[PDB]
Amino acid sequence: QECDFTPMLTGTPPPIYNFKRLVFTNCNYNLTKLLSLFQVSEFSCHQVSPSSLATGCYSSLTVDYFAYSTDMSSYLQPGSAGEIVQFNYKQDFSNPTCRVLATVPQNLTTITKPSNYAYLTECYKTSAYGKNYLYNAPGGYTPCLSLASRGFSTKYQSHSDGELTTTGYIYPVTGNLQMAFIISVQYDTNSVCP
Amino acid sequence: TTEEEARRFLVKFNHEAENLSHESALASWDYNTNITDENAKKMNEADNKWSDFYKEQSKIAQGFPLQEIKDPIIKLQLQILQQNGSSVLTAEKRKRLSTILTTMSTIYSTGKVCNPNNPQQCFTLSGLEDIMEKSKDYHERLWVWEGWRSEVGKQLRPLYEEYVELKNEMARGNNYKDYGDYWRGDYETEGEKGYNYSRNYLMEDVDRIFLEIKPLYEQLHAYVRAKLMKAYPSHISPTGCLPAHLLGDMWGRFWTNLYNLTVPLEKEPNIDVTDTMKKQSWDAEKIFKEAEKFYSSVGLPNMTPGFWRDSMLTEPSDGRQVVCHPTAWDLGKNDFRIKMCTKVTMDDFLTAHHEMGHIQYDMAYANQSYLLRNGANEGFHEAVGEVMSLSVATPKHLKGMGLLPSDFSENNETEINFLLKQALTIVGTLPFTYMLEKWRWMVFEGKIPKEQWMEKWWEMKREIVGVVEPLPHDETYCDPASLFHVANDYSFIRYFTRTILEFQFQEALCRTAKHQGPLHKCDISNSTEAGKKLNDMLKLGKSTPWTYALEKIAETKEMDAKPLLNYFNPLFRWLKEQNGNSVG
Numbered sequence: 001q002e003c004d005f006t007p008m009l010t011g012t013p014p015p016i017y018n019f020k021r022l023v024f025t026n027c028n029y030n031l032t033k034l035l036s037l038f039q040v041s042e043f044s045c046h047q048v049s050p051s052s053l054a055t056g057c058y059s060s061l062t063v064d065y066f067a068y069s070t071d072m073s074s075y076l077q078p079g080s081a082g083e084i085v086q087f088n089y090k091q092d093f094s095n096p097t098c099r100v101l102a103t104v105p106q107n108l109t110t111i112t113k114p115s116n117y118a119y120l121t122e123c124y125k126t127s128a129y130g131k132n133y134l135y136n137a138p139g140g141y142t143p144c145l146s147l148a149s150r151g152f153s154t155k156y157q158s159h160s161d162g163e164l165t166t167t168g169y170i171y172p173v174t175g176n177l178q179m180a181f182i183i184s185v186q187y188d189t190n191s192v193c194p
Numbered sequence: 195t196t197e198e199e200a201r202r203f204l205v206k207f208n209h210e211a212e213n214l215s216h217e218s219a220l221a222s223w224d225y226n227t228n229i230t231d232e233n234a235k236k237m238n239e240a241d242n243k244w245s246d247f248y249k250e251q252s253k254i255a256q257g258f259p260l261q262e263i264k265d266p267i268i269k270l271q272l273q274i275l276q277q278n279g280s281s282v283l284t285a286e287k288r289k290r291l292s293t294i295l296t297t298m299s300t301i302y303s304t305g306k307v308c309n310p311n312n313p314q315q316c317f318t319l320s321g322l323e324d325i326m327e328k329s330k331d332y333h334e335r336l337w338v339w340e341g342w343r344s345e346v347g348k349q350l351r352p353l354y355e356e357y358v359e360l361k362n363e364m365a366r367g368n369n370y371k372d373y374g375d376y377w378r379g380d381y382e383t384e385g386e387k388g389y390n391y392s393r394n395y396l397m398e399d400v401d402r403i404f405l406e407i408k409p410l411y412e413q414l415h416a417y418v419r420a421k422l423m424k425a426y427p428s429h430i431s432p433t434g435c436l437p438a439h440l441l442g443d444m445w446g447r448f449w450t451n452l453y454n455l456t457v458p459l460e461k462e463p464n465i466d467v468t469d470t471m472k473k474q475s476w477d478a479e480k481i482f483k484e485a486e487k488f489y490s491s492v493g494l495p496n497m498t499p500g501f502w503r504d505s506m507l508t509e510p511s512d513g514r515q516v517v518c519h520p521t522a523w524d525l526g527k528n529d530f531r532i533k534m535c536t537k538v539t540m541d542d543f544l545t546a547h548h549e550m551g552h553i554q555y556d557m558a559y560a561n562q563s564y565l566l567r568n569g570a571n572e573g574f575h576e577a578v579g580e581v582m583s584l585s586v587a588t589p590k591h592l593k594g595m596g597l598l599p600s601d602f603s604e605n606n607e608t609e610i611n612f613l614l615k616q617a618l619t620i621v622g623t624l625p626f627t628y629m630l631e632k633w634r635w636m637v638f639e640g641k642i643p644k645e646q647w648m649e650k651w652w653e654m655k656r657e658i659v660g661v662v663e664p665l666p667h668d669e670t671y672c673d674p675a676s677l678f679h680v681a682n683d684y685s686f687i688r689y690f691t692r693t694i695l696e697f698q699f700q701e702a703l704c705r706t707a708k709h710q711g712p713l714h715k716c717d718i719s720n721s722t723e724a725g726k727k728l729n730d731m732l733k734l735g736k737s738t739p740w741t742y743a744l745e746k747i748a749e750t751k752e753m754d755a756k757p758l759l760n761y762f763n764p765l766f767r768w769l770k771e772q773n774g775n776s777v778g
């Protein structure tokens with residue numbers, strides 16, 4: 001039996017700090033038909049060839065997708081330290097993974113366009129001695145997710161719960177919608193096969 | 195306890211300040227890059243909100259006596275809030291002081307000097323300064339010099355006399371001896387063993403540093419005088435002081451403009467890469483990405499995406515009015531920007547690195563408490579900025595980038611010309627700064643009575659700087675008030691220390707990079723070890739004594755002029771042979 005990539009083809013893709021994760025097990029997947037629906041701009045895979053990803057039996061498959069501008073590709077790379085890799089999303093390289101940056105074409109009408117591209121610029125605790133920053137675990141969520149869920153109306157707007165403080169940066173989306181996918185494979189490994 | 199209450203008060207102060215300061219800074223930025231009436235009024239309302247909050251919070255910090263505070267950081271932040279300042283004056287005197295300050299600033303800003311023989315030709319400050327910076331005629335410079343001295347500075351004497359007494363009254367109200375002591379207190383710290391510094395100790399420190407530096411200035415002064423004697427025959431004595439109006443600028447602050455008549459050999463052509471930059475199709479974005487690449491090569495972080503999206507790097511094409519002055523902005527909540535209208539030239543190439551050095555220093559201590567996000571003292575930020583432009587300007591860096599051909603030939607003549615130009619810019623201004631601050635300190639203290647302000651001033655001008663006035667000036671004149679920093683109430687010692695520190699940093703960064711040969715040929719690029727020990731000092735902010743921060747990088751607690759003399763060793767050795775026995 002196969003599995004549907006329809007949940008990632010409907011609705012408005014979430015922002016980077018609130019990315020959406022799909023887990024697939026015991027499915028006959030077709031990756032060649034998924035990337036054909038997008039205008040793939042970048043495909044960089046670690047510990048697996050881009051062609052080698054499409055074939056082979058894995059124990060589990062994971063897809064973390066969010067809305068992310070392609071010109072910010074340099075801030076999502078390994079070895080780069082910044083707000084994106086610390087307060088928003090830190091890729092886990094323990095398992096074979098690939099990162100895809102693709103632009104949604106006009107044909108895809110089931111994907112709604114979010115009003116703005118948004119991310120976090122800081123997430124910390126405050127004390128008389130300064131700021132104690134909080135950093136994401138590889139593949140995990142920011143501790144300031146509950147505060148960020150209130151939404152940001154302007155750039156560098158901050159939300160505070162008395163202990164945690166978070167700041168958000170937003171900017172309007174121009175043209176088509178640019179999306180980011182992180183595909184991780186985990187190795188019984190006969191569950192998920194092409 | 196009192197310390198726990200101080201800690202929670204500071205926690206809530208930080209919480210509110212982090213929002214109010216960014217709002218004020220954003221309003222100011224929106225005004226500066228887009229000049230209009232609405233932007234000005236929004237800037238004013240944001241500034242008023244911040245000022246009211248800060249005053250109401252400072253009224254609360256007075257309830258925590260510092261004798262019961264032990265932590266060196268809570269006490270440090272409470273010392274900043276508890277300051278009174280001009281609020282110690284008796285209501286009427288504060289308004290009178292504000293009126294005097296505005297009157298002096300307006301009088302300076304509205305200078306106007308007319309030609310004695312051509313009354314139709316009247317020049318403002320800018321067109322008058324352009325005359326001094328390019329003229330080569332004795333009387334044409336002399337009438338400009340005397341006119342500016344007797345037009346703007348002559349009417350600031352009655353205001354300056356009252357300014358001195360009101361500033362002394364408020365400083366004595368702030369538990370100081372005088373206003374010069376108030377200014378000197380910016381260098382005072384507390385420490386355990388040798389990390390403490392006094393405001394009664396800066397005077398002798400700068401005195402001994404100037405005594406160390408004076409033998410180089412004597413050689414440079416003798417060389418410049420020997421060349422000027424040929425430039426202006428029959429007006430300069432073979433062994434006398436240099437006339438005041440012939441030293442390039444209005445006040446003789448910098449001797450750079452003398453380079454054209456002081457260059458050792460006109461045959462040797464200076465390095466210029468503006469033509470190559472235009473030929474390779476460079477832009478503002480390419481210049482700033484090259485600067486970011488240079489700073490990343492030594493292990494410092496890259497720029498935030500908001501820096502690239504929000505900063506203004508070129509003059510707008512929409513015709514918006516912009517205050518075009520190169521500035522670096524730390525607006526608050528992880529928001530760093532640069533405002534400069536760049537062109538494709540070498541000077542802009544160096545200023546990009548300077549401003550990015552400012553930005554990197556700002557990014558370093560971004561996690562400190564609000565009141566402790568500054569340099570260790572007033573000279574650290576500019577020294578850090580300039581120590582990068584020191585390394586960038588080297589032909590080794592340009593050759594590595596490819597901005598000049600790899601077949602470029604480096605001979606000792608070019609090294610001597612480069613060192614001489616730098617000494618004209620750098621060494622030639624230290625005596626001016628030293629004597630100006632010394633005169634101000636003596637005036638505020640009271641060692642110079644009001645009846646002999648000029649008699650002493652020019653006297654010092656002949657003993658420290660070696661400069662003689664062209665015309666006698668009575669006590670109706672106030673020549674030092676003719677300067678910007680004097681009429682506009684600015685401290686001037688910042689420029690004396692920020693040079694002494696500068697080279698003290700550079701040598702420390704060239705010993706760690708394992709540099710071989712002369713110090714002026716040192717490039718710290720592709721050296722993560724130098725960046726590590728640099729960021730060790732940059733991360734401290736204002737939380738430590740500036741002596742501890744100085745030791746973190748330069749491995750010394752005391753400012754020394756030996757690195758500055760070591761930088762200019764080849765020039766000194768050449769100048770000694772050129773002058774012979776003419777020094778004096």
Ligand SMILES: *[C@@H]1O[C@H](CO[C@@H]2O[C@@H](C)[C@@H](O)[C@@H](O)[C@@H]2O)[C@@H](O)[C@H](O)[C@H]1NC(C)=O
Pocket residue numbers: 127129130131132561562733
């Ligand atoms: C502010 O940051 C200080 C130093 O930064 C931290 O330590 C260095 C060694 C690195 O690990 C760096 O990534 C860290 O950010 C802290 O020592 C200091 O405690 C911080 N301020 C507060 C209030 O916690």
Ligand SMILES: *[C@@H]1O[C@H](CO)[C@@H](O)[C@H](O)[C@H]1NC(C)=O
Pocket residue numbers: 030032033036194
């Ligand atoms: C996967 O989808 C592509 C889309 O064109 C199709 O050509 C291919 O046959 C599919 N492979 C399968 C179902 O194994």
Ligand SMILES: *[C@@H]1O[C@H](CO)[C@@H](O)[C@H](O)[C@H]1NC(C)=O
Pocket residue numbers: 106107
């Ligand atoms: C799909 O996109 C193509 C290329 O833009 C266009 O020609 C075609 O009409 C689109 N189809 C639909 C159903 O919108």
Ligand SMILES: *[C@@H]1O[C@H](CO)[C@@H](O)[C@H](O)[C@H]1NC(C)=O
Pocket residue numbers: 228230232233514
């Ligand atoms: C400049 O300020 C005016 C004030 O009305 C504003 O409308 C305009 O958008 C601003 N220009 C910009 C941001 O380019």
Ligand SMILES: *[C@@H]1O[C@H](CO)[C@@H](O)[C@H](O)[C@H]1NC(C)=O
Pocket residue numbers: 256276277278368369
């Ligand atoms: C500031 O003035 C107040 C009285 O208005 C005084 O209690 C306080 O000690 C002064 N602060 C300092 C630091 O001297």
Ligand SMILES: *[C@@H]1O[C@H](CO)[C@@H](O)[C@H](O)[C@H]1NC(C)=O
Pocket residue numbers: 388390391392395
């Ligand atoms: C530091 O304090 C000691 C002892 O009080 C004093 O002798 C010394 O002069 C101080 N250091 C400086 C640099 O002023």
Ligand SMILES: *[C@@H]1O[C@H](CO)[C@@H](O)[C@H](O)[C@H]1NC(C)=O
Pocket residue numbers: 327328451452454
């Ligand atoms: C020095 O000469 C150069 C040409 O080599 C000229 O551009 C510059 O303006 C001159 N400077 C002065 C102060 O005369």
Ligand SMILES: *[C@@H]1O[C@H](CO)[C@@H](O)[C@H](O)[C@H]1NC(C)=O
Pocket residue numbers: 491590591594595717719720
């Ligand atoms: C730094 O190293 C890189 C690669 O190792 C080289 O291309 C570059 O020229 C070097 N920079 C300098 C200023 O020598």
Ligand SMILES: *[C@@H]1O[C@H](CO)[C@@H](O)[C@H](O)[C@H]1NC(C)=O
Pocket residue numbers: 606607610768
């Ligand atoms: C440069 O060195 C040469 C020999 O290499 C020497 O003859 C010449 O005098 C030197 N010139 C200067 C300006 O120091």
Ligand SMILES: [Zn+2]
Pocket residue numbers: 548552576579
């Ligand atoms: Zn600067």
